[PDB]
Structure 1
Amino acid sequence: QTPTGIYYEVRGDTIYMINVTSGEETPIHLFGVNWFGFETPNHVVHGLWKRNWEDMLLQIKSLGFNAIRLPFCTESVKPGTQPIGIDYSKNPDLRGLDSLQIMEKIIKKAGDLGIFVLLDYHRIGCTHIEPLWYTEDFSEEDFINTWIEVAKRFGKYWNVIGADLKNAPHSVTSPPAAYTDGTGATWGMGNPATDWNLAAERIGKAILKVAPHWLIFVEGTQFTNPKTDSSYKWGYNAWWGGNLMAVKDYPVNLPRNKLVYSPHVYGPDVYNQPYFGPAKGFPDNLPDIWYHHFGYVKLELGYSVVIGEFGGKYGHGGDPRDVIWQNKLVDWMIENKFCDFFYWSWNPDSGDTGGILQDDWTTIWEDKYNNLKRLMD
């Protein structure tokens, strides 16, 4: 049942932490941030050139977050990979430690602060997000074996809630072709080699044999099947990791009490979506978009839905409509009780979204955070 004494599960659409010994069951909310970098060529969370890593965790906790999503790539989780770009005068206790050991230090420290950690297999290599959970050089069995090894090691950390199986499944070509061409993820198409709903079952079973106490977070795709995507006017305009419209007819075949649907959703700073034009109904059009793409999965079907990524520059050097977009989304999440989330990102160095921290890696965008804060209250 569990190597830690803690078992995570979903009841209703709420995530529970169970102390299996005492029998105590606590419902948890995930007020989370993404702290990225283990999936990049640095092979470490970013900003350790400007900050101490512990100081960073303390500051995250001081802002009322109690959860971190930790993106990783294959390399960062194999021993002996060496981190690049760390100021060791600021980080003495990180000297002579590899990308895996830092990852472990960060999680144990987070746990010390009651912070939950979601492990995210973000990239297969360490440069970009592939549309599928395999490449020419890295097979699905290789991907599954990496997850098995991640799960054997990090399953011993009480505060690790589970596995975001693959960051942002998506297409690298357009429909109708994208559905049959074998280069991008699908859902409900039929082909188990591209259909993310079927691959998430395989990879998830594999993880649950070794970390039975974990949760399996399954993102949306970008396109699913033409019948599903055609069912809604904005069916062809979902985010990578964002399209959960096929959950109703093609549910992932996994234990309901272990599964979390985890959509990405973004504003005009990531992509100039047609429904972001006031002409196409922005911003009042947004509740119904979100509903159709992923909101109905919780609100109609009652599964647990955790928004794994959302964010934007909040009018700081980007599209000013992002302020309206972030306000409207928080309003909607509060009204509809989506209280579990990971903001993208803690890091200021996300080129299209910036982060909670400003470019100085020290100070927060007060207004962006203030708006986010309403969800924590």
Structure 2
Amino acid sequence: QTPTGIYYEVRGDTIYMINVTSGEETPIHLFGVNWFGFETPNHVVHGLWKRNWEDMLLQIKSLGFNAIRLPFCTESVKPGTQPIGIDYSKNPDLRGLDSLQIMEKIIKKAGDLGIFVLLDYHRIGCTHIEPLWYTEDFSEEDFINTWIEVAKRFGKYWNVIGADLKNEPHSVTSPPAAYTDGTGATWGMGNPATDWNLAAERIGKAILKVAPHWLIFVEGTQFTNPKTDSSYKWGYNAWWGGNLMAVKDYPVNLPKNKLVYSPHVYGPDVYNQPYFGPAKGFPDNLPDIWYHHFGYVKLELGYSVVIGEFGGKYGHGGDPRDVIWQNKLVDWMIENKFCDFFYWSWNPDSGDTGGILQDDWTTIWEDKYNNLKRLMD
């Protein structure tokens, strides 16, 4: 049931790593970071114009992280795709390698450091996050076939825990139109061509056929269906990939022991949500909002919930409420035992969030990290 001898599964709401030969099981927690770049025109994780790739992984490990979420686009996982923006004096062992080979080298090195890797099909093109898992020139079959090829190749790396099926299903128009106009993802609306809960089953099933040992990470949508979204006062103000309110009545039809729900959640640096106003009760109003959008999926329904993205500038060149926001979110995660997450991002070159690293790609933001470090202990 595994090409590596290692099998990942959810027991209760906790992820376990199973050695199938010895029978040994260990619960694991994912203290993760997003290192992005393979999903961009660079076709490689960013920062290698300033840093050595291995030094980066060591620095990540040095801060107590044990997991990396690795966004990719279709092109980066095809042989022959050339990366742009590498300083080869700092990265001599990367000379001659295409994007796929660098991805392999990074995953293998991460594994050597005991770092788990989650593969994230972040973009179909390499420019922006499409609202759906297909485009006019790239069909759902093309999407699934790509995942199959990725699972065949990377399923052989022991430390790859699975597949984040599609980054941030979302809408590009407003409701109630968004539910039916076919431009955006839905959940429980009924049309299997827009319903992410149905698509996730189709894509997930295909992956589990070739990588039965993997977990399937399924993000939220932005809007689900009018009955669900209208059932809660802040039902129309969830993030892309962050609306899991339809899980209760419309659960994804996959084996529970292989499924992880993976919401994204953000603060005032990404969008000035009305509920970030003290006028609306910020920040003491946040736990109930998080609980409704996604928290109940673990606390009430007992599924594995892993926060796939969260982050913000933490008062460095952004909205100073972000400091309060990130502190409250970490407090809530600790209190409710959400111990699995991927911070967005390791990279500093994220326009609305910044990262763990500062713009010099070398020094970390001490305060931002100190808060996060609380989740690690």
Secondary structure, counterpart of 2:107 in structure 1:
helix
In 2: Cα distance, 1:278 partner to 1:41 partner: 40
Q: After superposition, what is the alpha-carbon deviation per residue over 1:163-206, rounded to whole angstroms, capped at 9, x for unaligned? A: 00000000000000000000000000000000000000000000
State TM-score, norm by structure 2.
1.00
Matched residue count: 377
Secondary structure, counterpart of 1:126 in structure 2:
coil
1:258-277 equivalent positions in 2, closer than 5 A = 258-277=258-277
In 2: Cα distance, 1:65 partner to 1:205 partner: 30
Q: CA deviation at 1:368?
A: 0.1
Q: CA deviation at 1:287?
A: 0.2
In 2: Cα distance, 1:323 partner to 1:369 partner: 11
In 2: Cα distance, 1:331 partner to 1:274 partner: 21
Q: After superposition, what is the alpha-carbon deviation per residue over 1:49-72, rounded to whole angstroms, capped at 9, x for unaligned? A: 000000000000000000000000
In 2: Cα distance, 1:169 partner to 1:274 partner: 22
- Give the corresponding residue for 2:35: 35
Q: CA deviation at 1:280?
A: 1.1
Secondary structure, counterpart of 1:69 in structure 2:
strand
Across the aligned residues of Structure 1 and Structure 2, the Cα RMSD in angstroms comes to 0.2
Q: After superposition, what is the alpha-carbon deviation per residue over 1:286-331, rounded to whole angstroms, capped at 9, x for unaligned? A: 0000000000000000000000000000000000000000000000
- Give the corresponding residue for 1:96: 96
Note the residue ranges of structure 2 that are not aligned, 5 or more in a row: none
In 1: Cα distance, 2:355 partner to 2:89 partner: 25
In 1: Cα distance, 2:346 partner to 2:4 partner: 28
- Give the corresponding residue for 1:255: 255
Q: After superposition, what is the alpha-carbon deviation per residue over 1:84-125, rounded to whole angstroms, capped at 9, x for unaligned? A: 000000000000000000000000000000000000000000
Note the residue ranges of structure 1 that are not aligned, 5 or more in a row: none
- Give the corresponding residue for 2:168: 168
Moved more, 273-282 or 252-261: 273-282
In 2: Cα distance, 1:39 partner to 1:250 partner: 30
In 2: Cα distance, 1:25 partner to 1:371 partner: 31
- Give the corresponding residue for 1:119: 119
In 1: Cα distance, 2:351 partner to 2:245 partner: 29
State TM-score, norm by structure 1.
1.00
In 1: Cα distance, 2:202 partner to 2:117 partner: 23
In 2: Cα distance, 1:292 partner to 1:162 partner: 26
Residue 195 (1) aligns with residue 195 (2): yes
Q: CA deviation at 1:231?
A: 0.4
Secondary structure, counterpart of 1:55 in structure 2:
helix
Secondary structure, counterpart of 1:118 in structure 2:
strand
Q: CA deviation at 1:272?
A: 0.6
In 2: Cα distance, 1:343 partner to 1:4 partner: 27
Q: After superposition, what is the alpha-carbon deviation per residue over 1:134-169, rounded to whole angstroms, capped at 9, x for unaligned? A: 000000000000000000000000000000000000
Q: CA deviation at 1:281?
A: 1.1
Q: CA deviation at 1:248?
A: 0.1
In 1: Cα distance, 2:197 partner to 2:351 partner: 30
In 2: Cα distance, 1:82 partner to 1:6 partner: 32
Q: After superposition, what is the alpha-carbon deviation per residue over 1:228-281, rounded to whole angstroms, capped at 9, x for unaligned? A: 000000000000000000000000000000000000000000011111111111
Secondary structure, counterpart of 2:228 in structure 1:
helix
